[PDB]
Design a protein around this ligand. Structure first.
Ligand SMILES: CCOC(=O)CNC(=O)CN(Cc1ccc2nc(-c3cc(C)c(=O)n(C)c3)n(CC3CCOCC3)c2c1)C(=O)c1ccc(N=[N+]=N)cc1
Length: 127
């Protein structure tokens, strides 16, 4: 069950630019989900080797996790909020299409996604 290289988390030739939305995504959205009791399965890429999941990276074409998202926000990898929101959505979608609906991991994803969507509802104006 081989692990792919983790997604890129630094862009060596992108200018450093804050926005109200990117500040919000790091300091409100990521920080709130990261400290949640159910965060830990999402804080790093799925280690298919350690968890013995030979089919995980066969089924999941676009791997994503909050560890990667946190590093991307800290490294100012995202040009805008929408790329970051897409990464959260991909992470949740991966969980829902791979794991059985009645799994603990899916209830954990649903709790984090509820919190995510509530915070995105109050996303600052594009400015
Ligand atoms: C000899 C080989 O033995 C092993 O496999 C050892 N590997 C270990 O350490 C495994 N763990 C910890 C661990 C860390 C991160 C994970 N991330 C996931 C996970 C999977 C899948 C498909 C997925 O889609 N996403 C997004 C994440 N899982 C699976 C679980 C499946 C159940 O629900 C919660 C996620 C993780 C597992 C544990 O065993 C462990 C879990 C909870 C504990 N709490 N207590 N008390 C204590 C330990």
């Amino acid at each position: 069950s081989m692990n792919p290289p983790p997604p890129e988390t630094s862009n060596p030739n992108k200018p450093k630019r804050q926005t109200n939305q990117l500040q919000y995504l790091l300091r409100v959205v990521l920080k709130t989900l990261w400290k949640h009791q159910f965060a830990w399965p999402f804080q790093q890429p799925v280690d298919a080797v350690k968890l013995n999941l030979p089919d995980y990276y066969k089924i999941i074409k676009t791997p994503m996790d909050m560890g990667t998202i946190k590093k991307r926000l800290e490294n100012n990898y995202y040009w805008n909020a929408q790329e970051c929101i897409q990464d959260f959505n991909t992470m949740f979608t991966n969980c829902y299409i791979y794991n059985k609906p009645g799994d603990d991991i899916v209830l954990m994803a649903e709790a984090l996604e509820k919190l995510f969507l509530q915070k995105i509802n109050e996303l600052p104006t594009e400015e």
